[PDB]
Design an enzyme around this catalytic site. Structure first.
Site, mmCIF file in Angstrom:
data_model
loop_
_atom_site.group_PDB
_atom_site.id
_atom_site.type_symbol
_atom_site.label_atom_id
_atom_site.label_comp_id
_atom_site.label_asym_id
_atom_site.label_seq_id
_atom_site.Cartn_x
_atom_site.Cartn_y
_atom_site.Cartn_z
ATOM 1 N N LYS A 22 0.740 -1.113 -0.109
ATOM 2 C CA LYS A 22 0.111 0.185 -0.274
ATOM 3 C C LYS A 22 0.882 1.328 0.126
ATOM 4 O O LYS A 22 0.639 2.127 -1.042
ATOM 5 C CB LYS A 22 -0.811 -0.149 1.183
ATOM 6 C CG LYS A 22 -2.134 -0.601 1.123
ATOM 7 C CD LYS A 22 -3.144 -0.800 2.466
ATOM 8 C CE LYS A 22 -2.799 -1.581 3.632
ATOM 9 N NZ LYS A 22 -1.561 -1.121 4.057
ATOM 10 N N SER A 23 1.767 1.401 0.929
ATOM 11 C CA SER A 23 2.614 2.520 1.084
ATOM 12 C C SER A 23 3.415 3.018 0.045
ATOM 13 O O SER A 23 3.247 4.239 -0.389
ATOM 14 C CB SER A 23 3.499 2.512 2.281
ATOM 15 O OG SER A 23 4.408 1.191 2.170
ATOM 16 N N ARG A 124 -8.733 8.077 13.009
ATOM 17 C CA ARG A 124 -7.432 8.149 12.954
ATOM 18 C C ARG A 124 -6.784 9.414 13.495
ATOM 19 O O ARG A 124 -7.024 10.445 13.082
ATOM 20 C CB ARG A 124 -6.967 7.791 11.669
ATOM 21 C CG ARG A 124 -7.385 6.317 10.871
ATOM 22 C CD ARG A 124 -6.815 5.172 11.811
ATOM 23 N NE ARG A 124 -5.254 4.986 11.329
ATOM 24 C CZ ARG A 124 -4.845 4.520 10.258
ATOM 25 N NH1 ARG A 124 -5.708 4.120 9.341
ATOM 26 N NH2 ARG A 124 -3.644 4.295 10.053
ATOM 27 N N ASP A 311 1.730 -11.615 12.745
ATOM 28 C CA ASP A 311 0.973 -10.371 12.135
ATOM 29 C C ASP A 311 1.167 -10.191 10.511
ATOM 30 O O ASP A 311 0.208 -10.155 9.801
ATOM 31 C CB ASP A 311 1.907 -9.073 12.688
ATOM 32 C CG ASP A 311 1.467 -8.697 14.119
ATOM 33 O OD1 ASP A 311 0.597 -9.306 14.607
ATOM 34 O OD2 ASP A 311 2.216 -8.245 14.733
ATOM 35 N N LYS A 338 -5.159 -8.416 19.220
ATOM 36 C CA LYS A 338 -4.945 -9.015 17.794
ATOM 37 C C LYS A 338 -4.287 -10.077 17.511
ATOM 38 O O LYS A 338 -4.758 -10.894 16.626
ATOM 39 C CB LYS A 338 -4.311 -7.633 17.148
ATOM 40 C CG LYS A 338 -4.505 -7.333 15.378
ATOM 41 C CD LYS A 338 -3.490 -6.625 14.893
ATOM 42 C CE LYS A 338 -2.082 -6.867 15.174
ATOM 43 N NZ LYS A 338 -1.190 -5.799 13.994
ATOM 44 N N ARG A 342 -5.791 -13.558 15.888
ATOM 45 C CA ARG A 342 -5.209 -14.169 14.513
ATOM 46 C C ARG A 342 -4.991 -15.499 14.978
ATOM 47 O O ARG A 342 -5.445 -16.442 14.013
ATOM 48 C CB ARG A 342 -4.268 -13.448 14.226
ATOM 49 C CG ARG A 342 -3.364 -13.953 13.255
ATOM 50 C CD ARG A 342 -3.757 -13.956 11.683
ATOM 51 N NE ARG A 342 -4.354 -12.495 11.438
ATOM 52 C CZ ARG A 342 -3.492 -11.418 10.794
ATOM 53 N NH1 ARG A 342 -2.169 -11.582 10.793
ATOM 54 N NH2 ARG A 342 -4.179 -10.412 10.591
ATOM 55 N N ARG A 383 -5.392 -12.114 5.365
ATOM 56 C CA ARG A 383 -4.355 -12.911 5.564
ATOM 57 C C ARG A 383 -4.898 -14.480 5.769
ATOM 58 O O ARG A 383 -4.147 -15.333 5.327
ATOM 59 C CB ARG A 383 -3.410 -12.386 6.673
ATOM 60 C CG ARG A 383 -2.735 -11.048 6.189
ATOM 61 C CD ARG A 383 -2.024 -10.365 7.222
ATOM 62 N NE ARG A 383 -0.829 -9.456 6.750
ATOM 63 C CZ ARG A 383 -1.133 -8.184 6.663
ATOM 64 N NH1 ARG A 383 -2.051 -7.801 7.279
ATOM 65 N NH2 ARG A 383 -0.286 -7.264 6.037
#
Ligand SMILES: [Cl-]
Length: 431
Positions: A22-23, A124, A311, A338, A342, A383
């Site tokens: 993305k970045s 955010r 992650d 998180k 997962r 994921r």
């Protein structure tokens, strides 16, 4: 579609490129849009966040032609001053990166812009960019220091020398963009050097850069760019080819991080057959990855690598499921929620596919075995959904993966890329 259905693979083969992350994708199209000349961007991630950036730039008059299924953009630059006020608020979707980069780009424009997004994005934090941007002379209104942000373009922006008490590549990237439209030079200094993809992209587009300093009044020059493939996206195919008999593939131009252990190396420790070749440093560091089927043995993941594995590369747990012996992830302390969620989802799916797996307060333990056909729930985690599509390559029967809507929005070309290499996955109607 809503659910993914797989059938066992006869063996993977072929060559593919996976999109970048993305970045880098955001930065590439943004810089290309204001350059002079035509830039072709390969490896552009086609997920919802990145296309939200694309539509925002187009609302401001950028010329961007999108070839979604090939991860290509063709951008005809509008020059440094070719952007125009958008008629409506720019919807940045769920992208914190989009809204922050756009805030930097638009602070020095001679027009006003409203930047917003979904309800997640509207929580955010933005103080970290708002304050420094205000020092250069930015006029940014917002309530609670979160979006929506109303940027009253200030054509009189002036450069600043910024001394941070802690590292942050997000602030830096924003100020570097605002610096392109600010009088004099803008400099960013940190206690320790943080990640610097923006700097390399600026050089790629021929902007002069001199701690890190940039000057206003310069001009961006179009220059074709091939975004390095995201190792997280590549991991799916690396594992697929590793665990599936008769497999031999090549992943071209994958971004490799030389300072970290990584998924390739954890796989090599399990006995994987991976060759990293054609390493280059003119793009981020890049390499071609050749992967062949190889029998694996379970390993003890060192603690430092436990959060990263969970992650970023939970598909590594799929490789543990087909290795001989046990694989153990034990972090020093109990995992964060998180992480815990997962691993619980991975364990439950693995159990449903006949694998003996146990969740631990600080990790997970997988007894290597044989993947069976069956049904698992991705819990709308792309994921997880992709890792089980990979488990489907070797499963004894078909695997149905529920709630895969988020794969289409995060990595839409996954299905076409999987199929092209011999990994059978198709979207079907769910529930
Ligand atoms: Cl994609």
């Amino acid at each position: 579609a809503m659910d993914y259905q797989t059938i066992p693979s006869q063996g993977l083969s072929g060559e593919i490129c996976v999109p970048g992350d993305k970045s880098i994708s955001h930065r590439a199209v943004l810089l290309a849009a204001i350059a002079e000349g035509q830039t072709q961007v390969d490896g552009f991630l086609m997920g919802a966040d990145n296309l939200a950036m694309v539509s925002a730039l187009q609302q401001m008059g950028a010329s961007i032609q999108v070839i979604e299924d090939e991860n290509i953009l063709v951008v005809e630059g509008v020059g440094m001053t070719g952007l125009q006020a958008p008629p409506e608020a720019l919807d940045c979707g769920n992208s914190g990166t989009a809204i922050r980069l756009l805030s930097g780009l638009l602070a020095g424009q001679p027009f006003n812009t409203v930047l917003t997004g979904d309800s997640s994005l509207q929580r955010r934090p933005m103080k970290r960019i708002i304050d420094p941007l205000t020092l250069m002379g930015a006029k940014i209104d917002s309530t609670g220091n979160v979006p929506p942000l109303k940027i009253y373009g200030n054509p009189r922006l002036t450069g600043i020398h910024y001394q941070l008490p802690m590292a942050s590549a997000q602030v830096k990237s924003c100020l570097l963009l605002a610096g392109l439209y600010a009088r004099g030079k803008t400099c960013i200094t940190e206690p320790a050097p943080s990640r610097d993809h923006t700097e390399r992209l600026l050089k790629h587009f021929h902007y002069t850069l001199q701690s890190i300093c940039v000057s206003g009044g310069g001009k961006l020059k179009a220059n074709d760019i091939s975004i390095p493939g995201d190792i997280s996206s590549a991991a799916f195919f690396i594992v697929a080819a590793t665990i599936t008999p008769g497999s031999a593939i090549r992943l071209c131009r994958v971004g490799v991080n030389p300072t970290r252990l990584g998924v390739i190396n954890l796989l090599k420790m399990m006995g994987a057959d991976i060759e990293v070749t054609h390493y280059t440093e003119k793009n981020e560091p890049t390499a071609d990855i050749t992967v062949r089927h190889a029998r694996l043995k379970g390993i003890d993941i060192p603690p430092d690598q436990v959060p990263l594995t969970i992650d970023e590369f939970p598909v590594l747990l799929i490789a543990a499921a087909v290795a001989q012996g046990k694989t153990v992830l034990r972090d020093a302390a109990e995992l964060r929620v998180k992480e815990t969620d997962r691993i619980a989802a991975m364990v439950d799916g693995l159990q449903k596919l006949g694998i003996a797996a146990e969740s631990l307060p600080d990790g997970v333990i997988i007894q290597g075995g044989t993947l069976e056909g069956g049904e698992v729930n991705s819990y709308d985690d792309h994921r997880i959904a992709m890792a089980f599509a990979v488990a489907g390559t070797l499963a004894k029967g078909p695997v149905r993966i529920r709630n895969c809507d988020n794969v289409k929005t995060s990595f839409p070309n996954f299905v076409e890329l999987a199929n092209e290499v011999g990994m059978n996955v198709k979207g079907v109607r769910g529930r």
